[PDB]
Design a protein around this ligand. Structure first.
Ligand SMILES: *[C@@H]1O[C@H](CO)[C@@H](O[C@@H]2O[C@H](CO)[C@@H](O[C@@H]3O[C@H](CO[C@H]4O[C@H](CO)[C@@H](O)[C@H](O)[C@@H]4O)[C@@H](O)[C@H](O)[C@@H]3O)[C@H](O)[C@H]2NC(C)=O)[C@H](O)[C@H]1NC(C)=O
Ligand SMILES: *[C@@H]1O[C@H](CO)[C@@H](O[C@@H]2O[C@H](CO)[C@@H](O[C@@H]3O[C@H](CO[C@H]4O[C@H](CO)[C@@H](O)[C@H](O)[C@@H]4O)[C@@H](O)[C@H](O)[C@@H]3O)[C@H](O)[C@H]2NC(C)=O)[C@H](O)[C@H]1NC(C)=O
Ligand SMILES: *[C@@H]1O[C@H](CO)[C@@H](O[C@@H]2O[C@H](CO)[C@@H](O[C@@H]3O[C@H](CO)[C@@H](O)[C@H](O)[C@@H]3O)[C@H](O)[C@H]2NC(C)=O)[C@H](O[C@@H]2O[C@@H](C)[C@@H](O)[C@@H](O)[C@@H]2O)[C@H]1NC(C)=O
Ligand SMILES: *[C@@H]1O[C@H](CO)[C@@H](O[C@@H]2O[C@H](CO)[C@@H](O[C@@H]3O[C@H](CO)[C@@H](O)[C@H](O)[C@@H]3O)[C@H](O)[C@H]2NC(C)=O)[C@H](O)[C@H]1NC(C)=O
Ligand SMILES: *[C@@H]1O[C@H](CO)[C@@H](O[C@@H]2O[C@H](CO)[C@@H](O)[C@H](O)[C@H]2NC(C)=O)[C@H](O)[C@H]1NC(C)=O
Ligand SMILES: *[C@@H]1O[C@H](CO)[C@@H](O[C@@H]2O[C@H](CO)[C@@H](O)[C@H](O)[C@H]2NC(C)=O)[C@H](O)[C@H]1NC(C)=O
Ligand SMILES: *[C@@H]1O[C@H](CO)[C@@H](O[C@@H]2O[C@H](CO)[C@@H](O)[C@H](O)[C@H]2NC(C)=O)[C@H](O)[C@H]1NC(C)=O
Ligand SMILES: *[C@@H]1O[C@H](CO)[C@@H](O[C@@H]2O[C@H](CO)[C@@H](O)[C@H](O)[C@H]2NC(C)=O)[C@H](O)[C@H]1NC(C)=O
Ligand SMILES: *[C@@H]1O[C@H](CO)[C@@H](O)[C@H](O)[C@H]1NC(C)=O
Ligand SMILES: *[C@@H]1O[C@H](CO)[C@@H](O)[C@H](O)[C@H]1NC(C)=O
Ligand SMILES: *[C@@H]1O[C@H](CO)[C@@H](O)[C@H](O)[C@H]1NC(C)=O
Ligand SMILES: *[C@@H]1O[C@H](CO)[C@@H](O)[C@H](O)[C@H]1NC(C)=O
Ligand SMILES: *[C@@H]1O[C@H](CO)[C@@H](O)[C@H](O)[C@H]1NC(C)=O
Lengths: 259, 367, 389, 97, 49
């Protein structure tokens, strides 16, 4: 589905504390109402495609229980060039920038409630094979609200992935909402989550999930969008939290507003 | 400081160029002196200081809202305080940007305007010519009516109605200025122009002007004398040009401001200290007097004017013949809606019997 | 004024600026460390024939944690120094870890002599790795003597730059001075070859407040007064900028707090005096400045008065009213009077008068006086022209 | 002292400095001319309205009531002698409308 | 169109020089508005044809 965003994809660009200051910034931004690609993770049918990392990727999803464990980033994804593994769970990540040799289905693959629903871990293709490595990082044993607690969907795991002059940055934000329908209208800035002076280039990125013919279709939606160089007027509240934003290129009204 | 403060390199390299700062010092100092002077002419036009008497027995004319109230710490008019509240907008010091407070104080200007209004109401137009001479306000209004060629009698014949109309008008202007703010656009724009000019001047500090960076300290730390100079001279050049630009439009704005100030001083000395005759100069309609009120960096005038409202037309004749001789009106004009002929003052319908004293003879009828 | 005589009045003079009081350096502490602790201190190294080659990047080449060691005898680089490694960022660092004969420590250094040196470790012609000599006899020692670290590499073919003696039975503590085994550790690093991904450590000092000090916070160098501030920075925002996009607030890196920046006082200075022959007593004024700091640079004073337009020195205050003679600002004016001294006062706007308003009396003049007054107006100035060339 | 090739740099530096100073002088000169011309227009108006005639404008031809004035040439300037009437002593009475 | 007429590189270069031409554009816009204002003031002194 060629959906359209409304106001999402806004992340804090800097560490500057601006109090009640309306500041303009020209940078990679996801355009307002930009048409974005919708994906339904089908649990034979599997929506796990390798999509281009066209210089800045905006991922969004409300899933629960960490169905999508992590990301694969690379320009070869076949151990020829060092690739980034970002498989994550409750405690910490196992960030791994290594010339890893991936598999066709390189993920743990916990297929619960799918075959006949008792419990187990199916495979361990998370570690397919490796030509070498070059570096690995393990983050703090945190505990983020990414586990399975549905209630009313409030785990909006929007993620901004950037790789500029070698520094790879990840912005994120947990946004609670109530409407269980498609992305509701609202404003919520995405704070930086992790910076990494990796120094590599990513051309293709693939998802990591957690022939199932006959099983019901998967119930999980996530959106992919691509940022583009645009100018945004960002409103820093008294307490330096971005509360509103405008894009000149949207329409003449926004153009005159920002000018 | 503004260009390259806190550097011996800054000092010596600026010394290389010469005396540009030297000139610009007087450049801005003359502007400041001119501001202070302009204030001096516009306001301090009185030798002595006057004070209103306690008894506000102005023939029923209400002087209060404009008048000072002892209660408030600032002895401003009600309207002047309202204007102060209406008009609205100090982090720029960081680069030697200094604001010199006006020599006078809003309090001093308030006292000056208070004395001006008091002297006006008390002694008509004489105080300007010299020592103020007490007069009845009604007498002054009669003299103004004469000045616009209006017979005094009407003034007394409608004293109460005139007072009521004046009171309603002053209240209405009070309410209008209280509600809307667009009237103060001129002063708001002046303030905004100044602020934006200073703000942009500050902004220019961040430009490399083709240099590797816009941080003189970073240039000094990273580079050694030769290429440090190669970059620093370029930065100095750019900041220099920005500064002369700023000084220039400051000069031009000050020039036009001085022209406006001279115009305002003339308006003061003419509308206020006397009853002029230049059409529309003292506002639209037939000018009577005016009342000044200070505002931050500006002045406000309350032009009071007469305006005819209702009309009743007639038929006229150039002159009259009584005994084969031509009689003409001394003043006014003849008028007849048929039945009878009369003469009246031009600016008011006051029919009168035509008689010997009203008119004067000249020649015979045929011509 | 380029004159031996000056007219009575006020005249602008050289400005004044509060010079800094001291310097302060506040920085975070020793951060993450590159894999150097292992290279210059470990229980076991690699074999001489299998001389270790470790690529190091994406870390902090913290020389502080490395140079805190005192076992080194002479640890300096021919082109750089460890001390100034705080503000140096590396691309990649190669670590060479192997155990050899003690006498072979220098033979690992570039520009050495001996055919037994290149047998196990060839000497490249452009080696920037600084040589380090340190004691590792205990680490390399074994009771009977370790012969496993042999130098059997006797390849006849010439050895290229980084293409990949046995006078003691084994590595024993009984070896004499200069003969005990030594672990050769060299930080062979190159710049301009790989993208910058390694940066250096930092150093900090004590804190001060309410003083014109040259503060350096996280590389931000600037002079000002540091005062505790109630502004609430965000958990990740360490500084704030004003509408002018200029730093105004800074959060301490070490402690978690917010501090303001207030550049210490400065402002014009001017002199007020009567005519030269009139007297030789002068008044000094500091526009937009306070007597709090006037003793910085007549420092005694003994006659000081605060004013909205600055604090005056060397003049006497008067609580009387007179016409302004030399304006000062904020309705303050100076005059020279009686013994004779300079005095300041509140200007007398004008003599008070109050007309006997009665709207029943009329003041009619009895007679007059004709007056003659002069008015002067420029009408032109001298023409002028020039040849540009 | 310098060979023409490198001396060109210093020559250009001096050229730029001298020309920019000259144009700054020109701008100052023309603004001075602007205000002096405004003053001259004012002076001509005053000449016509006070010398050639008796104006009613308040204090336009000097303080007090204006009778007439005289001109006097001055170097690059002009002087006016304003003759004015002014009451001197006042004695008051009782009035009625 | 004048300083760097139709040149991306020249525009990028001039970006380093602040907003001088921006201020100049503001000024000339004010000049044109002033022209119109002068016309209005000097001519449309009456509001009844
Ligand atoms: C010229 O106009 C002025 C109008 O401001 C006259 O000053 C007086 O101003 C007050 C309003 O502040 C007018 O109304 C008075 O209001 C006060 C208090 O205001 C409110 O509270 C009282 C109850 O305490 C209530 O009665 C009022 O209506 C307000 O709700 C009252 O205490 C007064 O009694 C009075 O109502 C005055 O009318 C107004 N006085 C006059 C004579 O207009 C000023 O006096 C006028 N100058 C002359 C010479 O007439
Ligand atoms: C427009 O026509 C009006 C009609 O009245 C004029 O009124 C004027 O009023 C005065 C008196 O108030 C007249 O003088 C005398 O008026 C009395 C009675 O007044 C009216 O009635 C008589 C007829 O009974 C009529 O002749 C008058 O004109 C008045 O209309 C008369 O009994 C006397 O004979 C004597 O007229 C004025 O004569 C009268 N003026 C005129 C022209 O009629 C009003 O003046 C007229 N306006 C103008 C500018 O001419
Ligand atoms: C660099 O300088 C010294 C090196 O030891 C440390 O600074 C100060 O040391 C104090 C005593 O150890 C610490 O006081 C404690 O602070 C903690 C903070 O949660 C409190 O819970 C505890 O009750 C003590 O008050 C203090 O942490 C620290 N303060 C300042 C301004 O420096 C410090 O070394 C550090 O040690 C640990 C605690 C980590 O912070 C390391 O990253 C670091 O090496 C360094 N100062 C810093 C980071 O600001
Ligand atoms: C930056 O500061 C503002 C307030 O200064 C934060 O918004 C919230 O506004 C109110 C009014 O000041 C603050 O007081 C009260 O806090 C309690 C919770 O402690 C809350 O229940 C009240 O309704 C009221 O908000 C409040 O502390 C403040 N923050 C919160 C969470 O309530 C603004 O959120 C701050 N910006 C940040 C944290 O990014
Ligand atoms: C969450 O993630 C961490 C890894 O980031 C997991 O760490 C495990 O710890 C043990 C002992 O160190 C290792 O043997 C395992 O290989 C790690 N598990 C992996 C890599 O999958 C941690 O166990 C995880 N916790 C949960 C509840 O999933
Ligand atoms: C006032 O002058 C008008 C002009 O003729 C006289 O007649 C009026 O003419 C205008 C149009 O020009 C019409 O709008 C009116 O309806 C006309 N009114 C009448 C009564 O004719 C008018 O008579 C004059 N009034 C006088 C002399 O009293
Ligand atoms: C000049 O300095 C003194 C203090 O050094 C100012 O007086 C007050 O001193 C107390 C000391 O606790 C402060 O709390 C006040 O804030 C100070 N007031 C001000 C306005 O700074 C004195 O007022 C200062 N005079 C000036 C700035 O003109
Ligand atoms: C006007 O007539 C009255 C008659 O009483 C007098 O008023 C005096 O006016 C002066 C003002 O200069 C005051 O100083 C006196 O206090 C007033 N005295 C009285 C009794 O009113 C005086 O004769 C005349 N005023 C003049 C010439 O100014
Ligand atoms: C995205 O959605 C909008 C609205 O339907 C549509 O105009 C636009 O063409 C879509 N983008 C595509 C088809 O690429
Ligand atoms: C396994 O068995 C049950 C039998 O009813 C069936 O509901 C389901 O389709 C199968 N898959 C599960 C439980 O995931
Ligand atoms: C891993 O080992 C191989 C040699 O066996 C080497 O070529 C490669 O550079 C090593 N590291 C990576 C990231 O490929
Ligand atoms: C200063 O000027 C002269 C010469 O010093 C001197 O006679 C005079 O007393 C002084 N000025 C005045 C106004 O007295
Ligand atoms: C003037 O009088 C006031 C009140 O007595 C006093 O506070 C002040 O110090 C006096 N100033 C001088 C110069 O006498």
């Amino acid at each position: 589905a060629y959906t359209n965003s409304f106001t999402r994809g806004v992340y804090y660009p800097d560490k500057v504390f601006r109090s009640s200051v309306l500041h303009s910034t020209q940078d990679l931004f996801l355009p307002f109402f930009s048409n974005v690609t919708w994906f339904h993770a089908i649990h034979k049918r599997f929506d796990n495609p390798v999509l281009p990392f066209n210089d800045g990727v905006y991922f969004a999803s409300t899933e629960k229980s960490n169905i999508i464990r992590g990301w694969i980033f690379g320009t070869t994804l076949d151990s020829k060039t060092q690739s980034l593994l970002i498989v994550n769970n409750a405690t910490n990540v196992v960030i791994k920038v290594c010339e890893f040799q991936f598999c066709n289905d390189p993920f743990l693959g916990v297929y619960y409630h799918k075959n006949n629903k008792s419990w187990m871990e199916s495979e361990f293709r998370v570690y397919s094979s490796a030509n070498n490595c070059t570096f690995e990082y393990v983050s703090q044993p945190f505990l983020m609200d990414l586990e399975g607690k549905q209630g009313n969907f409030k785990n909006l795991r929007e993620f901004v992935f950037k790789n500029i002059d070698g520094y790879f940055k990840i912005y994120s934000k947990h946004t609670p909402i109530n409407l269980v329908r498609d992305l509701p209208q609202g404003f919520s800035a995405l704070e930086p989550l992790v910076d990494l002076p990796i120094g590599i280039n990513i051309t293709r990125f693939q998802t990591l999930l957690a022939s199932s013919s006959g099983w019901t279709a998967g119930a999980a939606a996530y959106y992919v969008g691509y940022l583009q160089p645009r100018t945004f007027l960002l409103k820093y509240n008294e307490n330096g939290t971005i509360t509103d934003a405008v894009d000149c290129a949207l329409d003449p009204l926004s153009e005159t507003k920002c000018t | 400081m503004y260009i390259c403060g806190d550097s011996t390199e800054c000092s010596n390299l600026l010394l290389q160029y010469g005396s540009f700062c030297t000139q610009l010092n007087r450049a801005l100092t003359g502007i400041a002196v001119e501001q202070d002077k302009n204030t001096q002419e516009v306001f301090a036009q009185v030798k002595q200081i006057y004070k209103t008497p306690p008894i506000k027995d102005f023939g029923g004319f209400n002087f209060s809202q404009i008048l000072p109230d002892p209660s408030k710490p600032s002895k401003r008019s009600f309207i002047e305080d309202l204007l102060f509240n209406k008009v609205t907008l100090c982090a720029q010091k960081f680069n030697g940007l200094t604001v010199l407070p006006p020599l006078l104080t809003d309090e001093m200007i308030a006292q000056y305007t208070s004395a001006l209004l008091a002297g006006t109401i008390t002694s008509g137009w004489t105080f300007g010519a010299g020592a103020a001479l007490q007069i009845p306000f009604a007498m002054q209004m009669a003299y103004r009516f004469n000045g616009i060629g209006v017979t005094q009698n009407v003034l007394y014949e409608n004293q109460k109605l005139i007072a009521n109309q004046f009171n309603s008008a002053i209240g209405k202007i009070q309410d209008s200025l209280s509600s809307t703010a667009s009237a103060l656009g001129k002063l708001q724009d002046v303030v905004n122009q100044n602020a934006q000019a200073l703000n942009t001047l500050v902004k220019q500090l961040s430009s490399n002007f083709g240099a590797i960076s816009s941080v003189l300290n970073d240039i000094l730390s990273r580079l050694d004398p030769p290429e440090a100079e190669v970059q620093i001279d370029r930065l100095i050049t750019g900041r220099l040009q920005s500064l002369q630009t700023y000084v220039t439009q400051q000069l031009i704005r000050a020039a036009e401001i001085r022209a406006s100030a001279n115009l305002a001083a003339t308006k003061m000395s003419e509308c206020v200290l006397g009853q002029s005759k230049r059409v529309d100069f003292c506002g639209k309609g037939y000018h009577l007097m005016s009342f000044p009120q200070s505002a931050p960096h500006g002045v406000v005038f309350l032009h009071v004017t007469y305006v005819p409202a209702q009309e009743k037309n007639f038929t006229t004749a150039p002159a009259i013949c009584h005994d084969g001789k031509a009689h003409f009106p001394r003043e006014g004009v003849f008028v007849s809606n048929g039945t009878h002929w009369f003469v009246t003052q031009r600016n008011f319908y006051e029919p009168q019997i035509i008689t010997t004293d009203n008119t004067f003879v000249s020649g015979n009828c045929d011509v | 004024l380029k004159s031996f005589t000056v007219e009575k009045g006020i005249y602008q003079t050289s400005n004044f600026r509060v010079q800094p009081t001291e310097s302060i350096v506040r920085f975070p502490n020793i951060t993450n460390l590159c894999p150097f602790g292992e290279v210059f201190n470990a229980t076991r190294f690699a074999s001489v024939y299998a001389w270790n080659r470790k690529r190091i990047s994406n870390c902090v080449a913290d020389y502080s944690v490395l140079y805190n060691s005192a076992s080194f005898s002479t640890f300096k680089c021919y082109g750089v120094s460890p001390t100034k490694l705080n503000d140096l960022c590396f691309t990649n660092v190669y670590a060479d870890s192997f155990v050899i004969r003690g006498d072979e420590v220098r033979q690992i250094a570039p520009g050495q002599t001996g055919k037994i040196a290149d047998y196990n470790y060839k000497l490249p012609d452009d080696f920037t790795g600084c040589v380090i000599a340190w004691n590792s006899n205990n680490l390399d020692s074994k009771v009977g003597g370790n012969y496993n670290y042999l130098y059997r590499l006797f390849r006849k073919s010439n050895l290229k730059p980084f293409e990949r003696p046995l006078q003691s039975y084994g590595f024993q503590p009984t070896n004499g001075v200069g003969y005990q085994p030594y672990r050769v550790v060299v930080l062979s690093f190159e710049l301009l070859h790989a993208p910058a991904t390694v940066c250096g450590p930092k150093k900090s000092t004590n804190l001060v407040k309410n003083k014109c000090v040259n503060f350096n916070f996280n590389g931000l160098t600037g002079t000002g007064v540091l005062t505790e501030s109630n502004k609430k920075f965000l958990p990740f925002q360490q500084f704030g900028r004003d509408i002018a996009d200029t730093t105004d607030a800074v959060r301490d890196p070490q402690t978690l707090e917010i501090l303001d920046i207030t550049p210490c006082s400065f402002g014009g200075v001017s002199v007020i005096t009567p005519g030269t022959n009139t007297s030789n007593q002068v008044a000094v004024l500091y526009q937009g400045v306070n007597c709090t700091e006037v003793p910085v640079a007549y420092s005694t004073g003994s006659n000081v008065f605060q004013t909205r337009a600055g604090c005056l020195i060397g003049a006497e205050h008067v609580n009387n009213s007179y016409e302004c003679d030399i304006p000062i600002g904020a309705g303050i004016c100076a005059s020279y009077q009686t013994s004779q001294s300079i005095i300041a006062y509140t200007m007398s706007l004008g003599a008070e008068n109050s007309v006997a308003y009665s709207n029943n009396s009329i003041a009619i003049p009895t007679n007059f006086t004709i007056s003659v007054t002069t008015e002067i107006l420029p009408v032109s100035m001298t023409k002028t022209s020039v040849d540009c060339t």
